[PDB]
Amino acid sequence: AKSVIHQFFESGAKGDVDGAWACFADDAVWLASEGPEPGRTYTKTEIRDLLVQLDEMARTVRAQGMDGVFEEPVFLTDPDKAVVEWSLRKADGEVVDRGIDLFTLRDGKILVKDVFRKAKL
Amino acid sequence: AKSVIHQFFESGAKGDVDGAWACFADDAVWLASEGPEPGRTYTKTEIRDLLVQLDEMARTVRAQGMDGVFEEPVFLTDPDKAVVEWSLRKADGEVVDRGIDLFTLRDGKILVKDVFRKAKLAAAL
Ligand SMILES: CCC[C@H]1C(=O)CC(=O)O[C@@H]1CC(=O)/C(C)=C/C[C@@H]1O[C@](C)(CCO)C[C@@H]1C
Ligand SMILES: CCC[C@H]1C(=O)CC(=O)O[C@@H]1CC(=O)/C(C)=C/C[C@@H]1O[C@](C)(CCO)C[C@@H]1C
Protein backbone atom coordinates (compact mmCIF):
# COMPACT_ATOMS: atom_id res chain seq x y z
CA ALA A 1 0.00 0.00 0.00
CA LYS A 2 1.11 3.63 -0.43
CA SER A 3 0.69 4.30 3.33
CA VAL A 4 -0.98 2.80 6.39
CA ILE A 5 -4.06 4.89 5.61
CA HIS A 6 -4.19 3.35 2.14
CA GLN A 7 -3.75 -0.05 3.77
CA PHE A 8 -6.69 0.61 6.11
CA PHE A 9 -9.10 1.47 3.34
CA GLU A 10 -7.82 -1.32 1.12
CA SER A 11 -8.33 -3.90 3.88
CA GLY A 12 -11.79 -2.52 4.60
CA ALA A 13 -12.74 -2.65 0.93
CA LYS A 14 -11.63 -6.29 1.01
CA GLY A 15 -13.64 -7.22 4.10
CA ASP A 16 -10.39 -7.95 5.98
CA VAL A 17 -11.46 -6.72 9.40
CA ASP A 18 -8.31 -8.14 10.98
CA GLY A 19 -6.06 -6.44 8.43
CA ALA A 20 -7.78 -3.10 8.98
CA TRP A 21 -7.69 -3.45 12.77
CA ALA A 22 -3.95 -4.08 12.67
CA CYS A 23 -3.40 -0.65 11.08
CA PHE A 24 -4.07 0.90 14.52
CA ALA A 25 -1.46 1.36 17.25
CA ASP A 26 -2.35 -0.28 20.54
CA ASP A 27 -2.92 3.18 22.09
CA ALA A 28 -4.97 4.41 19.08
CA VAL A 29 -8.40 6.03 19.33
CA TRP A 30 -11.22 6.27 16.84
CA LEU A 31 -13.18 9.44 17.54
CA ALA A 32 -16.60 8.71 16.11
CA SER A 33 -18.67 11.42 14.44
CA GLU A 34 -21.64 11.14 16.85
CA GLY A 35 -21.90 10.70 20.59
CA PRO A 36 -22.02 12.55 23.89
CA GLU A 37 -18.42 13.78 24.10
CA PRO A 38 -19.45 15.18 21.49
CA GLY A 39 -18.62 12.21 19.34
CA ARG A 40 -17.48 8.99 20.94
CA THR A 41 -14.03 7.68 21.84
CA TYR A 42 -13.33 4.07 20.86
CA THR A 43 -10.11 2.43 22.00
CA LYS A 44 -8.38 -0.22 19.95
CA THR A 45 -10.16 -3.07 21.72
CA GLU A 46 -13.46 -1.42 20.81
CA ILE A 47 -12.51 -0.65 17.20
CA ARG A 48 -12.71 -4.20 15.85
CA ASP A 49 -16.46 -4.38 16.50
CA LEU A 50 -16.93 -1.04 14.71
CA LEU A 51 -15.17 -2.53 11.69
CA VAL A 52 -17.47 -5.57 11.75
CA GLN A 53 -20.48 -3.25 11.84
CA LEU A 54 -19.12 -1.16 8.98
CA ASP A 55 -18.43 -4.22 6.83
CA GLU A 56 -22.02 -5.36 7.15
CA MET A 57 -23.39 -1.85 6.49
CA ALA A 58 -21.17 -1.63 3.42
CA ARG A 59 -22.68 -4.84 2.03
CA THR A 60 -26.21 -3.67 2.85
CA VAL A 61 -25.91 -0.30 1.08
CA ARG A 62 -24.32 -2.04 -1.92
CA ALA A 63 -27.35 -4.33 -2.16
CA GLN A 64 -29.53 -1.20 -2.31
CA GLY A 65 -27.54 0.23 -5.21
CA MET A 66 -25.65 2.75 -3.10
CA ASP A 67 -22.01 3.61 -3.80
CA GLY A 68 -19.54 4.41 -1.01
CA VAL A 69 -16.72 6.62 -2.31
CA PHE A 70 -13.49 7.28 -0.38
CA GLU A 71 -11.23 9.89 -1.95
CA GLU A 72 -7.50 9.38 -2.13
CA PRO A 73 -5.85 10.44 1.16
CA VAL A 74 -4.23 13.88 1.06
CA PHE A 75 -1.40 14.40 3.50
CA LEU A 76 -0.86 17.67 5.35
CA THR A 77 2.37 19.68 5.55
CA ASP A 78 2.72 17.64 8.74
CA PRO A 79 3.31 14.27 7.02
CA ASP A 80 1.90 12.35 10.01
CA LYS A 81 -1.57 13.87 9.37
CA ALA A 82 -3.87 13.38 6.43
CA VAL A 83 -7.50 13.83 5.42
CA VAL A 84 -9.74 11.38 3.63
CA GLU A 85 -12.95 12.82 2.16
CA TRP A 86 -15.80 10.35 1.66
CA SER A 87 -19.44 10.13 0.58
CA LEU A 88 -22.35 7.76 0.11
CA ARG A 89 -24.27 8.14 -3.14
CA LYS A 90 -27.51 6.71 -4.43
CA ALA A 91 -27.07 4.79 -7.67
CA ASP A 92 -27.87 7.85 -9.82
CA GLY A 93 -25.23 9.92 -7.95
CA GLU A 94 -27.26 11.76 -5.30
CA VAL A 95 -25.33 12.22 -2.04
CA VAL A 96 -27.01 11.03 1.15
CA ASP A 97 -23.94 11.01 3.43
CA ARG A 98 -20.75 13.03 3.31
CA GLY A 99 -17.86 13.40 5.69
CA ILE A 100 -14.13 13.65 6.26
CA ASP A 101 -11.63 11.74 8.42
CA LEU A 102 -8.59 13.43 9.94
CA PHE A 103 -5.81 10.86 10.55
CA THR A 104 -2.87 11.16 12.91
CA LEU A 105 -0.08 8.64 12.36
CA ARG A 106 2.86 7.51 14.44
CA ASP A 107 5.64 5.17 13.29
CA GLY A 108 3.57 3.75 10.43
CA LYS A 109 0.47 3.11 12.50
CA ILE A 110 -2.79 5.00 12.87
CA LEU A 111 -2.85 6.82 16.20
CA VAL A 112 -6.05 8.86 15.75
CA LYS A 113 -8.92 8.52 13.32
CA ASP A 114 -11.10 11.60 13.89
CA VAL A 115 -14.37 11.22 11.96
CA PHE A 116 -16.75 14.04 10.98
CA ARG A 117 -19.92 13.94 8.88
CA LYS A 118 -22.53 16.36 7.63
CA ALA A 119 -25.76 16.26 9.62
CA LYS A 120 -28.54 15.78 7.08
CA LEU A 121 -30.93 17.19 9.66
CA ALA B 1 -2.49 38.29 8.16
CA LYS B 2 -0.36 35.25 7.31
CA SER B 3 -3.16 34.06 4.96
CA VAL B 4 -6.74 34.93 4.04
CA ILE B 5 -7.78 32.22 6.52
CA HIS B 6 -5.91 34.04 9.29
CA GLN B 7 -7.60 37.27 8.17
CA PHE B 8 -11.05 35.67 8.25
CA PHE B 9 -10.79 34.46 11.85
CA GLU B 10 -9.16 37.72 13.00
CA SER B 11 -12.07 39.73 11.57
CA GLY B 12 -14.79 37.36 12.75
CA ALA B 13 -13.54 37.42 16.33
CA LYS B 14 -13.71 41.23 16.26
CA GLY B 15 -17.33 41.19 15.08
CA ASP B 16 -16.18 42.78 11.80
CA VAL B 17 -18.78 41.10 9.60
CA ASP B 18 -17.82 43.24 6.60
CA GLY B 19 -14.14 42.32 6.85
CA ALA B 20 -14.84 38.62 7.28
CA TRP B 21 -17.24 38.74 4.34
CA ALA B 22 -14.64 40.34 2.08
CA CYS B 23 -12.44 37.23 2.51
CA PHE B 24 -14.79 35.27 0.24
CA ALA B 25 -14.57 35.13 -3.53
CA ASP B 26 -17.72 36.30 -5.28
CA ASP B 27 -18.28 32.70 -6.41
CA ALA B 28 -17.49 31.27 -2.97
CA VAL B 29 -19.71 28.77 -1.12
CA TRP B 30 -19.98 28.13 2.61
CA LEU B 31 -21.04 24.49 3.03
CA ALA B 32 -22.71 24.43 6.45
CA SER B 33 -22.51 21.41 8.74
CA GLU B 34 -26.27 20.71 8.73
CA GLY B 35 -28.97 20.63 6.08
CA PRO B 36 -30.63 18.49 3.41
CA GLU B 37 -27.78 18.35 0.90
CA PRO B 38 -26.48 16.93 3.36
CA GLY B 39 -25.29 20.22 4.79
CA ARG B 40 -26.51 23.57 3.50
CA THR B 41 -24.99 25.67 0.74
CA TYR B 42 -24.60 29.43 1.29
CA THR B 43 -23.47 31.57 -1.63
CA LYS B 44 -21.55 34.78 -1.02
CA THR B 45 -24.74 36.88 -0.92
CA GLU B 46 -26.14 34.54 1.76
CA ILE B 47 -22.91 34.37 3.79
CA ARG B 48 -23.19 37.86 5.24
CA ASP B 49 -26.40 37.02 7.12
CA LEU B 50 -24.82 33.80 8.33
CA LEU B 51 -21.90 35.86 9.62
CA VAL B 52 -24.32 38.20 11.42
CA GLN B 53 -26.24 35.26 12.93
CA LEU B 54 -22.94 33.71 14.01
CA ASP B 55 -21.84 37.07 15.42
CA GLU B 56 -24.80 37.22 17.82
CA MET B 57 -24.26 33.52 18.51
CA ALA B 58 -20.75 34.38 19.67
CA ARG B 59 -22.00 37.12 22.00
CA THR B 60 -24.39 34.68 23.67
CA VAL B 61 -21.68 32.09 24.27
CA ARG B 62 -19.26 34.86 25.25
CA ALA B 63 -21.88 36.12 27.72
CA GLN B 64 -21.77 32.72 29.44
CA GLY B 65 -18.06 32.00 30.01
CA MET B 66 -17.81 29.85 26.87
CA ASP B 67 -14.70 30.22 24.72
CA GLY B 68 -14.22 29.20 21.10
CA VAL B 69 -10.79 28.03 19.92
CA PHE B 70 -9.78 28.04 16.24
CA GLU B 71 -6.50 26.31 15.47
CA GLU B 72 -3.94 27.58 13.02
CA PRO B 73 -4.72 26.29 9.50
CA VAL B 74 -2.65 23.30 8.41
CA PHE B 75 -2.34 23.15 4.64
CA LEU B 76 -2.67 20.06 2.48
CA THR B 77 -0.13 18.98 -0.11
CA ASP B 78 -2.40 21.02 -2.41
CA PRO B 79 -1.32 24.41 -1.04
CA ASP B 80 -4.70 25.97 -1.88
CA LYS B 81 -6.44 23.77 0.72
CA ALA B 82 -6.19 23.75 4.52
CA VAL B 83 -7.93 22.33 7.59
CA VAL B 84 -8.86 24.39 10.65
CA GLU B 85 -9.77 22.39 13.76
CA TRP B 86 -12.02 24.20 16.22
CA SER B 87 -13.82 23.72 19.53
CA LEU B 88 -16.25 25.54 21.82
CA ARG B 89 -15.69 24.92 25.50
CA LYS B 90 -17.15 25.89 28.84
CA ALA B 91 -15.16 27.89 31.38
CA ASP B 92 -14.20 24.68 33.20
CA GLY B 93 -12.94 23.18 29.91
CA GLU B 94 -15.85 20.90 29.02
CA VAL B 95 -16.22 20.59 25.25
CA VAL B 96 -19.63 21.75 24.03
CA ASP B 97 -18.96 21.60 20.29
CA ARG B 98 -16.07 20.50 18.10
CA GLY B 99 -15.51 20.45 14.37
CA ILE B 100 -13.23 20.98 11.41
CA ASP B 101 -13.29 23.31 8.43
CA LEU B 102 -11.81 22.35 5.08
CA PHE B 103 -10.89 25.53 3.20
CA THR B 104 -10.34 25.81 -0.52
CA LEU B 105 -8.57 29.02 -1.51
CA ARG B 106 -8.15 30.64 -4.90
CA ASP B 107 -6.34 33.85 -5.85
CA GLY B 108 -6.01 34.87 -2.21
CA LYS B 109 -9.73 34.54 -1.42
CA ILE B 110 -11.81 31.80 0.18
CA LEU B 111 -13.55 29.77 -2.52
CA VAL B 112 -15.00 27.02 -0.30
CA LYS B 113 -15.47 26.73 3.46
CA ASP B 114 -16.61 23.13 4.08
CA VAL B 115 -17.77 22.83 7.70
CA PHE B 116 -18.11 19.61 9.71
CA ARG B 117 -19.11 19.23 13.37
CA LYS B 118 -19.42 16.33 15.75
CA ALA B 119 -23.04 15.45 16.43
CA LYS B 120 -23.89 15.61 20.14
CA LEU B 121 -26.09 12.56 20.77
CA ALA B 122 -26.74 9.88 23.33
CA ALA B 123 -26.44 7.39 20.45
CA ALA B 124 -27.03 6.89 16.72
CA LEU B 125 -28.68 3.73 15.38
C1 LIG C 1 -21.22 1.53 13.07
C2 LIG C 1 -21.23 3.05 13.36
C3 LIG C 1 -19.85 3.65 13.14
C4 LIG C 1 -19.90 4.88 12.17
C5 LIG C 1 -20.48 6.10 12.94
O6 LIG C 1 -21.66 6.10 13.27
C7 LIG C 1 -19.47 7.26 13.23
C8 LIG C 1 -18.01 6.90 13.03
O9 LIG C 1 -17.08 7.61 13.36
O10 LIG C 1 -17.68 5.66 12.49
C11 LIG C 1 -18.54 5.16 11.61
C12 LIG C 1 -18.77 6.05 10.35
C13 LIG C 1 -17.64 5.86 9.40
O14 LIG C 1 -16.49 5.54 9.71
C15 LIG C 1 -17.97 5.96 7.95
C16 LIG C 1 -16.82 6.19 7.14
C17 LIG C 1 -19.24 5.80 7.56
C18 LIG C 1 -19.43 5.88 6.10
C19 LIG C 1 -20.23 4.77 5.38
O20 LIG C 1 -19.41 3.55 5.47
C21 LIG C 1 -19.77 2.63 4.49
C22 LIG C 1 -20.80 1.78 5.20
C23 LIG C 1 -18.55 1.81 4.03
C24 LIG C 1 -17.59 1.16 5.12
O25 LIG C 1 -17.28 -0.12 4.90
C26 LIG C 1 -20.34 3.55 3.31
C27 LIG C 1 -20.54 4.98 3.90
C28 LIG C 1 -19.69 6.00 3.18
C1 LIG D 1 -17.84 28.05 12.40
C2 LIG D 1 -19.34 28.12 12.00
C3 LIG D 1 -19.68 27.04 10.96
C4 LIG D 1 -21.04 26.59 11.22
C5 LIG D 1 -21.86 26.29 9.93
O6 LIG D 1 -21.26 26.01 8.91
C7 LIG D 1 -23.36 26.17 10.12
C8 LIG D 1 -23.60 25.03 11.10
O9 LIG D 1 -24.68 24.39 11.18
O10 LIG D 1 -22.49 24.61 11.99
C11 LIG D 1 -21.17 25.20 11.98
C12 LIG D 1 -20.54 25.30 13.38
C13 LIG D 1 -21.28 26.28 14.20
O14 LIG D 1 -22.43 26.62 13.95
C15 LIG D 1 -20.61 26.92 15.37
C16 LIG D 1 -21.60 27.41 16.23
C17 LIG D 1 -19.29 26.99 15.45
C18 LIG D 1 -18.72 27.68 16.63
C19 LIG D 1 -19.16 29.10 17.06
O20 LIG D 1 -18.59 30.11 16.20
C21 LIG D 1 -18.47 31.36 16.86
C22 LIG D 1 -19.77 32.10 16.56
C23 LIG D 1 -17.22 32.11 16.34
C24 LIG D 1 -16.97 32.31 14.76
O25 LIG D 1 -16.85 33.58 14.37
C26 LIG D 1 -18.36 30.99 18.40
C27 LIG D 1 -18.77 29.51 18.51
C28 LIG D 1 -17.60 28.72 19.15
What single letter denotes the amino acid at residue B100?
I
Is the bond preceding residue B38 a cis peptide, omega within 30 degrees?
yes
Q: Return d(Cα B97, Cα A50) in angstroms, integer.
A: 23
Domain contains B61: yes
User: What is the Cα–Cα distance from A93 to B119, expressed in whole angstroms?
Assistant: 25
The CA distance from A20 to A10, in Å, is 8
3-state secondary structure of B104: strand
Q: What is the CATH number of the domain that holds B59?
A: 3.10.450.50
Residue with CA at minimum distance from ligand 2 atom 5: B32
Atom of ligand 1 nearest to the CA of A97: 28
d(CA B32, CA B102): 11
Instruction: Write the burial class of residue A79 (CB in 10 Å: 0-12 exposed, 13-18 middle, 19+ buried).
Output: exposed
Q: Is there an atom of ligand 1 within 6 Å of A54 CB?
A: yes
In a domain, B83, yes or no: yes
Q: A79 CB near a chain B CB, below 8 Å? A: no
Identify the bridge partners of residue B84 per DSSP, sorted by sequence position: B101
Instruction: Domain count for chain A, please give it.
Output: 1
Give the single-character DSSP code of B75. Answer: E
User: Residue A56 in 3-state DSSP?
Assistant: helix
| A39: closest CA of chain B, how far (Å) | 6
- State which approach was used to obtain the coordinates: X-ray
What is residue B42's DSSP assignment?
Answer: E
How many helices (DSSP H) and strands (DSSP E) are in chain B?
3, 8
Q: Say what the resolution is, in angstroms.
A: 1.6
State whether B33 and A102 contact (CB < 8 Å).
Answer: no
Q: In which domain, by residue range, is A8 found?
A: 4-117
**What are the backbone angles phi and psi of residue B77, rounded to the nearest 5°?**
-70, -20
